[PDB]
Design an enzyme around this catalytic site. Structure first.
Site, PDB file in Angstrom:
ATOM      1  N   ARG A 180       0.889  -1.242  -0.152  1.00  0.00           N
ATOM      2  CA  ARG A 180       0.077   0.202  -0.113  1.00  0.00           C
ATOM      3  C   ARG A 180       0.790   1.141  -0.030  1.00  0.00           C
ATOM      4  O   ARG A 180       1.949   1.332   0.714  1.00  0.00           O
ATOM      5  CB  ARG A 180      -0.838  -0.111   1.180  1.00  0.00           C
ATOM      6  CG  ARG A 180      -2.132  -0.966   1.051  1.00  0.00           C
ATOM      7  CD  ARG A 180      -3.374  -0.459   0.588  1.00  0.00           C
ATOM      8  NE  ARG A 180      -4.148  -1.401  -0.194  1.00  0.00           N
ATOM      9  CZ  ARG A 180      -4.435  -1.386  -1.390  1.00  0.00           C
ATOM     10  NH1 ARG A 180      -4.091  -0.614  -2.197  1.00  0.00           N
ATOM     11  NH2 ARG A 180      -5.314  -2.274  -2.009  1.00  0.00           N
ATOM     12  N   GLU A 191      -2.153   8.627  -4.732  1.00  0.00           N
ATOM     13  CA  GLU A 191      -2.410   7.771  -5.994  1.00  0.00           C
ATOM     14  C   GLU A 191      -3.581   8.403  -6.508  1.00  0.00           C
ATOM     15  O   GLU A 191      -4.933   8.413  -5.985  1.00  0.00           O
ATOM     16  CB  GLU A 191      -2.592   6.249  -5.604  1.00  0.00           C
ATOM     17  CG  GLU A 191      -2.260   5.226  -6.366  1.00  0.00           C
ATOM     18  CD  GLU A 191      -2.206   3.915  -6.049  1.00  0.00           C
ATOM     19  OE1 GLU A 191      -1.143   3.448  -5.222  1.00  0.00           O
ATOM     20  OE2 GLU A 191      -3.093   3.080  -6.170  1.00  0.00           O
ATOM     21  N   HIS A 230      -0.158   0.424 -10.088  1.00  0.00           N
ATOM     22  CA  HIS A 230      -0.831  -0.371  -9.421  1.00  0.00           C
ATOM     23  C   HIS A 230      -1.341  -1.553 -10.165  1.00  0.00           C
ATOM     24  O   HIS A 230      -2.768  -1.605 -10.147  1.00  0.00           O
ATOM     25  CB  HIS A 230      -1.787   0.396  -8.684  1.00  0.00           C
ATOM     26  CG  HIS A 230      -2.580  -0.152  -7.320  1.00  0.00           C
ATOM     27  ND1 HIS A 230      -3.283   0.319  -6.451  1.00  0.00           N
ATOM     28  CD2 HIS A 230      -2.610  -1.409  -7.013  1.00  0.00           C
ATOM     29  CE1 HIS A 230      -3.646  -0.312  -5.545  1.00  0.00           C
ATOM     30  NE2 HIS A 230      -3.182  -1.481  -5.913  1.00  0.00           N
TER      31      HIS A 230
HETATM   32  N1  LIG Z   1      -0.200  -4.040  -5.429  1.00  0.00           N
HETATM   33  C1  LIG Z   1      -1.283  -4.761  -5.796  1.00  0.00           C
HETATM   34  O1  LIG Z   1      -2.127  -4.801  -6.795  1.00  0.00           O
HETATM   35  C2  LIG Z   1      -2.286  -5.219  -4.531  1.00  0.00           C
HETATM   36  C3  LIG Z   1      -2.701  -6.433  -4.651  1.00  0.00           C
HETATM   37  C4  LIG Z   1      -3.104  -7.314  -3.245  1.00  0.00           C
HETATM   38  C5  LIG Z   1      -2.222  -7.254  -2.230  1.00  0.00           C
HETATM   39  N2  LIG Z   1      -1.960  -5.765  -1.922  1.00  0.00           N
HETATM   40  C6  LIG Z   1      -1.485  -5.571  -0.769  1.00  0.00           C
HETATM   41  O2  LIG Z   1      -0.128  -6.376  -0.832  1.00  0.00           O
HETATM   42  C7  LIG Z   1      -0.235  -6.625   0.687  1.00  0.00           C
HETATM   43  C8  LIG Z   1       0.300  -7.906   0.820  1.00  0.00           C
HETATM   44  O3  LIG Z   1      -1.058  -8.646   0.715  1.00  0.00           O
HETATM   45  P1  LIG Z   1      -1.519 -10.094   1.753  1.00  0.00           P
HETATM   46  O4  LIG Z   1      -2.391 -10.727   0.891  1.00  0.00           O
HETATM   47  O5  LIG Z   1      -0.079 -10.703   1.564  1.00  0.00           O
HETATM   48  O6  LIG Z   1      -1.911  -9.563   3.198  1.00  0.00           O
HETATM   49  P2  LIG Z   1      -1.873 -10.702   4.369  1.00  0.00           P
HETATM   50  O7  LIG Z   1      -2.873 -10.272   5.160  1.00  0.00           O
HETATM   51  O8  LIG Z   1      -1.930 -11.975   3.954  1.00  0.00           O
HETATM   52  O9  LIG Z   1      -0.507 -10.208   5.450  1.00  0.00           O
HETATM   53  C9  LIG Z   1      -0.370  -8.921   5.841  1.00  0.00           C
HETATM   54  C10 LIG Z   1       0.849  -9.178   6.640  1.00  0.00           C
HETATM   55  O10 LIG Z   1       1.357  -7.725   7.202  1.00  0.00           O
HETATM   56  C11 LIG Z   1       1.776  -7.957   8.466  1.00  0.00           C
HETATM   57  N3  LIG Z   1       1.842  -7.056   9.288  1.00  0.00           N
HETATM   58  C12 LIG Z   1       0.786  -6.347  10.167  1.00  0.00           C
HETATM   59  N4  LIG Z   1       1.532  -5.309  10.681  1.00  0.00           N
HETATM   60  C13 LIG Z   1       2.712  -5.515  10.526  1.00  0.00           C
HETATM   61  C14 LIG Z   1       3.872  -4.734  10.959  1.00  0.00           C
HETATM   62  N5  LIG Z   1       3.549  -3.688  11.866  1.00  0.00           N
HETATM   63  N6  LIG Z   1       4.924  -4.811  10.688  1.00  0.00           N
HETATM   64  C15 LIG Z   1       5.148  -5.999  10.018  1.00  0.00           C
HETATM   65  N7  LIG Z   1       4.190  -6.798   9.186  1.00  0.00           N
HETATM   66  C16 LIG Z   1       3.112  -6.339   9.734  1.00  0.00           C
HETATM   67  C17 LIG Z   1       0.221  -9.203   9.018  1.00  0.00           C
HETATM   68  O11 LIG Z   1       0.803  -9.926  10.253  1.00  0.00           O
HETATM   69  C18 LIG Z   1       0.353 -10.065   7.999  1.00  0.00           C
HETATM   70  O12 LIG Z   1       1.120 -11.090   8.352  1.00  0.00           O
HETATM   71  C19 LIG Z   1      -1.468  -5.870   1.164  1.00  0.00           C
HETATM   72  O13 LIG Z   1      -1.355  -4.394   1.682  1.00  0.00           O
HETATM   73  C20 LIG Z   1      -2.208  -5.676   0.261  1.00  0.00           C
HETATM   74  O14 LIG Z   1      -3.516  -4.664   0.575  1.00  0.00           O
HETATM   75  C21 LIG Z   1      -1.511  -5.146  -3.261  1.00  0.00           C
END
Ligand SMILES: NC(=O)c1ccc[n+]([C@@H]2O[C@H](COP(=O)([O-])OP(=O)(O)OC[C@H]3O[C@@H](n4cnc5c(N)ncnc54)[C@H](O)[C@@H]3O)[C@@H](O)[C@H]2O)c1
Ligand SMILES: NC(=O)c1ccc[n+]([C@@H]2O[C@H](COP(=O)([O-])OP(=O)(O)OC[C@H]3O[C@@H](n4cnc5c(N)ncnc54)[C@H](O)[C@@H]3O)[C@@H](O)[C@H]2O)c1
Lengths: 329, 329
Positions: free
Chosen positions: B234, B263, B282
């Site tokens: 994000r 964004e 994105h």
């Molecule tokens: N670029 C894109 O097109 C889009 C696509 C989907 C995913 N997103 C984003 O990619 C990211 C990862 O997706 P995901 O499915 O793996 O989410 P997820 O829920 O599977 O994993 C999130 C992880 O962040 C960790 N986290 C939370 N707080 C933290 C902190 N203070 N320090 C370190 N780690 C922490 C959580 O414990 C969790 O393990 C998300 O932000 C998601 O919104 C990007």
């Protein structure tokens, strides 16, 4: 007096030059014309050839004390081997020093085409962020990669794309056993046409021979999928560059990524520079610090071996060894 | 026949077909709150395409609402409290593009290491001899730092270790260390240690209050001057002002970004005037496969709630008893 070595182009790491200077006097040329080589080669015992510089037969013939020619990497297409053999001059290459590096670079190129990475980077930087609305990246999982030439690099590339991306990997290579592909999860096919019809990505990793010279021409691009991509990191002469340009204009394939060119270096006005889905790099796939150090040490140590009369590990013309003996005693 | 309002279209048309087969649908494009308000009063389900907003005053107008479905994981733009107060079930659709973002992350990591878009530009301008001025990085035995070891972080860590030969460290306070163990990574309690050891830092955390602007100048000061940042999570996780300063002061070598804050990024974004910067608009989660699994899953959950069956991704399961009170019993 200490022997003389000529470096037609620097090595990629100067640990190799340091080794040469322990026992020889060296002269370094920088993209020299044929005459500059002829002036500097007359009394040398060893020659190093930085690709893509060329060492023609006429130059080898002026070198009356030459014992060894070393290339910068695997390829020897810039050496006149027949001329060296006729003179009793040993030719060595330095193979398998950049295997990991080229497989990484090939994976990077395969991924960059699938995600339109350079094109998209240029769009955002010019302000066209909203090109995203019409973009549709490719998911590489379960797509098919076709390897042409299943040697050190091709086999590693097949292994990595399996583990890293979950791609199905097909290979064409008449001179290796089928078991070599199965060990890394690929399938060795007897019929190149099948690989061309089935592949979404086709990556070239063959040695340059009379069979692979201009193997990829318009006839072969007609057999590939309109959606598919070509990647060439092996040698430029494997691809008819003029045919590749026609293939892209006529939508026979969707794009390509090239680290090697013919002629190399490529001209300032190469028509490939104006195409959609073309990604180029200037023969750097095998040039990482790790690989450059290993290949420099290897070339320098082999040159020193032949000056001492010792048989080197990477002779490409071993039939010339006895005539070398004849001249070296 | 029940109504469904789609505040924004679905990612793949197959989902709108699945809805149309049993419901009557209306579709809106980036509608104002008033446009939604006089389109929502008679519907039973609502779909919200990220990043559209569904405000509480809108939900209160919808008297027969049973289900809200977001297009992906994110529900932050939905008023969960108002939905619960009304017995409206909110569902998300998580983990639909995990493989797509992992792939895009590998592409960006590798493209940074090989200077791929910069080298492409150099050859196209006839600057092939830039090869004498630089050397790509070999990923093997470098250290990758994963920040956020969720769906995407776990996959990225596994492939970079298994297929690329990188040491992988991870920081994530909210998963056990055994989760890193399983894929060959090491979960560290102290983020500073990961920052000092990593040649590549990739961000894969959720956006929370703790991770908002987590990557500021005090963090870039601790990374290696030679390290790269990759952000596909994000945009608000990175203070872009500090990232700009960090590149200018050479606190890090470069970065690859799929997300931005704000964004879309502005036309005069300082990030464009840096050579080791790679941007994408994105698109990391966008693949035909990922779009199709998200749209089908979103439609299927809307259809379950309209039938009375618990959907698998209830954001507010505490609303279920009141939902029963309203529409069943
Ligand atoms: N670029 C894109 O097109 C889009 C696509 C989907 C995913 N997103 C984003 O990619 C990211 C990862 O997706 P995901 O499915 O793996 O989410 P997820 O829920 O599977 O994993 C999130 C992880 O962040 C960790 N986290 C939370 N707080 C933290 C902190 N203070 N320090 C370190 N780690 C922490 C959580 O414990 C969790 O393990 C998300 O932000 C998601 O919104 C990007
Ligand atoms: N920076 C770079 O781009 C550079 C780096 C090093 C290697 N090179 C080039 O990569 C290429 C492959 O390198 P390698 O070390 O793996 O060589 P290699 O000798 O290990 O493998 C070459 C393979 O090509 C196969 N081959 C030969 N003739 C064939 C044919 N007619 N059809 C199909 N396959 C055939 C061989 O059987 C062999 O398996 C070489 O041309 C080499 O010069 C690229």
């Amino acid at each position: 007096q200490k022997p003389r070595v000529l470096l037609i182009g620097k090595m990629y790491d100067e640990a190799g030059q340091k080794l040469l200077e322990e026992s020889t006097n060296i002269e370094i040329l920088s993209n020299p014309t044929p005459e500059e080589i002829n002036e500097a080669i007359q009394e040398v015992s060893g020659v190093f050839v930085r690709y893509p510089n060329n060492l023609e037969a006429s130059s080898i013939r002026l070198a009356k004390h030459l014992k060894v020619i070393s290339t910068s990497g695997f390829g020897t297409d810039s050496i006149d081997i027949m001329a060296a053999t006729e003179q009793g001059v040993i030719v060595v290459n330095n193979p398998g020093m950049s295997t990991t590096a080229v497989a990484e670079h090939t994976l990077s190129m395969i991924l960059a085409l699938a995600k339109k990475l350079p094109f998209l980077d240029h769009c955002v930087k010019k302000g066209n962020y909203l090109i995203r609305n019409q973009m549709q990246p490719i998911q590489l999982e379960n797509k098919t990669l076709g390897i042409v030439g299943l040697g050190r690099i091709g086999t590693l590339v097949a292994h990595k794309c399996n583990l890293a991306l979950g791609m199905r990997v097909l290979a064409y290579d008449p001179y290796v056993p089928a078991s070599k592909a199965e060990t890394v999860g690929a399938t060795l096919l007897k019929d190149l046409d099948v690989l061309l019809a089935e592949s979404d990505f086709v990556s070239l990793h063959t040695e340059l021979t009379s069979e692979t010279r201009e193997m990829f021409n318009i006839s072969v691009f007609k057999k590939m999928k309109p959606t598919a991509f070509l990647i060439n990191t092996s040698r430029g002469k494997v691809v008819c560059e003029k045919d590749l340009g026609i293939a892209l204009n006529q939508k026979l394939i969707s794009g390509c990524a090239l680290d090697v060119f013919e002629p190399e270096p490529p001209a300032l006005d190469n028509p490939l520079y104006n195409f959609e889905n073309v990604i180029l790099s200037p023969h750097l796939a095998g040039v990482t610090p790790e690989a450059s150090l290993a290949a420099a040490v290897s070339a320098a140590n082999q040159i020193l071996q032949v000056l001492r009369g010792e048989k080197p590990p990477y002779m490409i013309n071993p039939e010339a060894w006895n005539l070398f003996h004849h001249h070296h005693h």
